[PDB]
Amino acid sequence: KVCEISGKRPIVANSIQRRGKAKREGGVGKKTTGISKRRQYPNLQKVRVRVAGQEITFRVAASHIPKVYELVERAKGLKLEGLSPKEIKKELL
Amino acid sequence: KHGKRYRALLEKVDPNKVYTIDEAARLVKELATAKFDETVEVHAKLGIDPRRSDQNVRGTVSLPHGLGKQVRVLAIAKGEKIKEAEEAGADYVGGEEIIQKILDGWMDFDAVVATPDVGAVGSKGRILGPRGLLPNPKAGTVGFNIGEIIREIKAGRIEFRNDKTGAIHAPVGKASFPPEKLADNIRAFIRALEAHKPEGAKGTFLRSVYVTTTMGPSVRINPHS
Amino acid sequence: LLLECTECKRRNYATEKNKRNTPNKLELRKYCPWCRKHTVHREV
RNA sequence: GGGGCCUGACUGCGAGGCCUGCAAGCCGAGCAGGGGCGAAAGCCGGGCCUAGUGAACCGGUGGUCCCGUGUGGAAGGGCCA
RNA sequence: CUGGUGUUGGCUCUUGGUCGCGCCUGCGUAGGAUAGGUGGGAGCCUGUGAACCCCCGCCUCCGGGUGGGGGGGAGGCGCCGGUGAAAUACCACCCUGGCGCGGCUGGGGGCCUAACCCUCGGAUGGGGGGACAGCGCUUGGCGGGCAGUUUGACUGGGGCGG
RNA sequence: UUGCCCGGUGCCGGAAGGUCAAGGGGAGGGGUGCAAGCCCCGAACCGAAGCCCCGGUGAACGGCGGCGUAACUAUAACGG
RNA sequence: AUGUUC
RNA sequence: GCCCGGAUAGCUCAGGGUAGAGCAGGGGAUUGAAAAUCCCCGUGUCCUUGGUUCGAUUCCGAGUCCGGGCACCA
Numbered sequence: 196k197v198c199e200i201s202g203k204r205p206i207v208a209n210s211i212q213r214r215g216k217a218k219r220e221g222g223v224g225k226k227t228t229g230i231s232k233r234r235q236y237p238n239l240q241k242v243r244v245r246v247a248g249q250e251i252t253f254r255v256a257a258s259h260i261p262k263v264y265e266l267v268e269r270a271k272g273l274k275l276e277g278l279s280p281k282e283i284k285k286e287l288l
Numbered sequence: 289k290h291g292k293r294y295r296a297l298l299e300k301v302d303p304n305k306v307y308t309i310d311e312a313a314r315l316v317k318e319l320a321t322a323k324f325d326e327t328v329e330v331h332a333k334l335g336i337d338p339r340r341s342d343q344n345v346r347g348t349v350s351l352p353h354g355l356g357k358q359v360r361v362l363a364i365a366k367g368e369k370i371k372e373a374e375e376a377g378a379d380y381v382g383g384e385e386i387i388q389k390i391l392d393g394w395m396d397f398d399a400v401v402a403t404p405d406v407g408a409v410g411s412k413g414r415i416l417g418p419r420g421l422l423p424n425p426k427a428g429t430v431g432f433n434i435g436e437i438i439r440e441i442k443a444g445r446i447e448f449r450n451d452k453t454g455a456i457h458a459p460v461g462k463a464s465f466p467p468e469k470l471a472d473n474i475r476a477f478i479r480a481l482e483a484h485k486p487e488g489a490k491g492t493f494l495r496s497v498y499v500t501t502t503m504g505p506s507v508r509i510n511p512h513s
Numbered sequence: 514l515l516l517e518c519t520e521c522k523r524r525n526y527a528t529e530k531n532k533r534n535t536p537n538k539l540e541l542r543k544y545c546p547w548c549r550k551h552t553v554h555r556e557v
Numbered sequence: 558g559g560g561g562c563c564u565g566a567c568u569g570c571g572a573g574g575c576c577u578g579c580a581a582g583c584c585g586a587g588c589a590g591g592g593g594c595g596a597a598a599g600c601c602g603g604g605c606c607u608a609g610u611g612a613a614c615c616g617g618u619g620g621u622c623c624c625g626u627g628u629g630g631a632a633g634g635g636c637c638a
Numbered sequence: 639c640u641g642g643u644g645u646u647g648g649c650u651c652u653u654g655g656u657c658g659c660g661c662c663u664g665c666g667u668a669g670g671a672u673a674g675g676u677g678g679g680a681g682c683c684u685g686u687g688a689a690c691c692c693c694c695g696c697c698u699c700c701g702g703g704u705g706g707g708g709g710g711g712a713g714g715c716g717c718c719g720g721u722g723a724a725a726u727a728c729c730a731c732c733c734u735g736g737c738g739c740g741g742c743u744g745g746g747g748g749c750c751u752a753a754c755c756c757u758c759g760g761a762u763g764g765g766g767g768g769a770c771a772g773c774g775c776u777u778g779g780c781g782g783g784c785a786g787u788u789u790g791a792c793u794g795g796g797g798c799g800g
Numbered sequence: 801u802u803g804c805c806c807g808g809u810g811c812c813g814g815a816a817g818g819u820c821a822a823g824g825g826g827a828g829g830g831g832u833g834c835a836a837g838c839c840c841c842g843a844a845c846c847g848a849a850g851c852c853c854c855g856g857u858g859a860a861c862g863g864c865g866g867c868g869u870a871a872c873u874a875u876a877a878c879g880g
Numbered sequence: 881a882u883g884u885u886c
Numbered sequence: 887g888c889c890c891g892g893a894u895a896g897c898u899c900a901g902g903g904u905a906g907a908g909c910a911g912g913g914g915a916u917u918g919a920a921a922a923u924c925c926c927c928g929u930g931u932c933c934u935u936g937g938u939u940c941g942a943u944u945c946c947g948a949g950u951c952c953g954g955g956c957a958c959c960a
């Protein structure tokens with residue numbers, strides 16, 4: 196599925212199977228022996244984090260994991276409360 | 289595990305120090321402390337696959353200043369050659385019939401030469417061969433100019449021939465030459481090796497080279513010097 | 514067995530063949546080279 | 558069938574033709590370059606002849622008057638083998 | 639399924655593989671017998687303590703190699719000779735195959751808790767697993783479970799044969 | 801009651817060996833710069849599962865086809 | 881340890 | 887194509903100077919005889935090619951035919 200910070204989502208990618216010897220080498224060259232739809236997912240991972248009273252957890256891409264911590268800090272200026280980790284979350288940017 | 293007499297020489301070499309073809313030539317005659325005129329041996333570990341029989345440093349080299357030795361040459365030849373060889377320098381010649389006198393039991397010669405048209409010598413050879421004395425073309429000892437060969441042999445023209453370990457060795461004089469006269473003989477030897485480098489060989493050719501005596505310790509040295 | 518003929522030191526070409534067991538060991542042969550005219554030629 | 562020198566089992570072409578749906582296959586005098594044998598006339602562009610073969614495409618290697626993505630090179634092609 | 643890598647962090651333990659480096663190591667038969675290769679070699683060792691008994695240590699083809707050491711108190715070894723394809727002292731250059739310290743590159747464990755995962759009469763917490771598992775990207779494999787397809791023409795029908 | 805045969809196939813096991821991917825590694829080589837450099841090629845060698853290999857496995861896939869010999873003949877408990 | 885027959 | 891391995895008597899297989907056991911035939915030996923058992927025979931291009939060597943089936947390098955694994959085939 197989807198990075199809550201970066202918006203990365205799975206994408207369609209063909210997978211190409213080739214045989215043969217590259218022309219760069221001995222040669223004649225590569226022949227494609229099959230091309231198939233498949234998807235590539237992002238590397239989503241769970242990140243729990245303290246913030247205010249409530250805990251709150253993010254589904255986020257490995258690449259953007261720091262950006263979570265970079266949010267938590269920059270939300271020390273916000274006025275944060277209510278048993279609503281829900282709300283805390285939308286309040287993060 | 290070593291002579292009182294030998295351990296008194298270990299003091300006079302530095303293991304690590306590499307010497308120079310005259311530091312070593314000076315140094316050598318005062319490592320010849322054994323009760324006779326020691327021979328001065330040169331030893332190269334080579335950079336050949338010793339297995340690749342074609343990367344095989346076999347040759348001879350004529351040594352100026354000769355060997356200081358006294359090589360008793362047996363010849364084998366028919367018609368005319370016979371005497372162009374009886375004189376030329378040989379000590380027993382000829383001439384076909386003596387292979388029966390190689391009953392054997394008779395080995396009192398240090399080197400053997402022959403004229404190509406005896407072939408028939410090489411058969412009977414089994415006793416002459418593994419002792420390294422069997423006339424070859426390869427290194428040394430067969431030709432129709434049999435006197436021309438008997439001669440230079442006597443002016444110590446040495447065979448040399450790498451072994452199954454990639455090492456090679458040669459007598460290059462006596463510990464009683466001037467040092468200027470070894471040093472030169474040493475230089476005449478490497479020069480022969482260097483020009484029997486199998487063209488087709490990885491690594492540096494003369495990885496190591498040492499100088500030493502019968503009964504002495506060695507000197508790790510620098511060829512070219 | 515098939516085979517080239519090279520003007521001596523360099524290029525050029527003509528190409529024949531020998532029967533390898535029977536008389537082959539290095540094919541030597543007088544032949545005209547297009548480039549700079551008339552020469553030996555070894556095999557390759 | 559035997560012997561001596563050789564390497565024309567040449568490069569550049571090729572008048573004219575045999576065969577023939579195409580494509581292919583076949584024979585070839587003669588000219589030039591440089592050569593071989595022969596005293597010379599001349600003969601020699603493989604084999605007495607008719608089977609011993611395989612379009613293109615894609616690649617490989619050796620050359621080389623060629624193109625080289627602003628320019629010089631280079632990559633990579635081309636052309637000849 | 640499997641390597642690599644992300645999520646993935648903390649300590650160890652001890653393993654291959656390869657190089658310096660040291661120690662060692664070498665056994666067909668024949669033959670004094672344990673003959674690694676090639677030089678060199680006629681002399682080498684010995685009050686810097688031979689022969690010969692002992693005992694310590696590695697190595698062992700259980701024969702002995704090899705290092706030291708006691709005791710002993712003056713000869714031993716090599717050339718020679720037998721055998722053998724090849725000789726034996728002594729000297730040198732040579733991983734040939736181990737071991738031991740180390741570098742450099744892999745491998746497998748163990749312990750930890752804090753990521754992850756499970757769980758606890760709801761828990762900021764407790765317990766269990768634990769950097770494994772799960773999951774992302776990449777490698778190669780297995781893979782009629784599934785898919786798309788190919789499976790020639792001649793021919794007294796076609797097939798079989800040719 | 802359910803025999804014989806574990807060669808081949810499958811499954812189970814197996815840290816001798818063979819081969820095998822990304823990746824690591826860079827002996828050595830190249831293109832270009834006036835050069836610092838910037839870009840490539842690339843040899844040893846290290847590198848999983850797999851397959852090969854070794855062992856097992858039959859109520860796993862399977863396989864169990866074929867000269868001599870006895871009171872004549874025939875056959876063949878018996879051998880090959 | 882085994883080791884048949886007339 | 888790359889890396890590994892194999893090729894030795896009729897078959898099945900062992901192994902730098904030298905070619906072997908085994909099976910089957912034949913002599914012997916053992917037994918009072920017969921079996922079992924023991925001994926001795928005769929058998930090779932050591933795949934082919936060039937190298938190294940005084941010598942090669944053995945070591946080297948190539949090649950062919952097989953086997954294993956991996957490339958791939960215009």
Ligand SMILES: [Mg+2]
Nearest residue numbers: 257258259644
């Ligand atoms: Mg990142």
Ligand SMILES: [Mg+2]
Nearest residue numbers: 571572573574
């Ligand atoms: Mg025409």
Ligand SMILES: [Mg+2]
Nearest residue numbers: 613614615960
């Ligand atoms: Mg096409």
Ligand SMILES: [Mg+2]
Nearest residue numbers: 223614615616
């Ligand atoms: Mg093309």
Ligand SMILES: [Mg+2]
Nearest residue numbers: 625626628629
């Ligand atoms: Mg340009």
Ligand SMILES: [Mg+2]
Nearest residue numbers: 210777778779
């Ligand atoms: Mg895959």
Ligand SMILES: [Mg+2]
Nearest residue numbers: 782784785786
């Ligand atoms: Mg189907």
Ligand SMILES: [Mg+2]
Nearest residue numbers: 806807855856
């Ligand atoms: Mg089995």
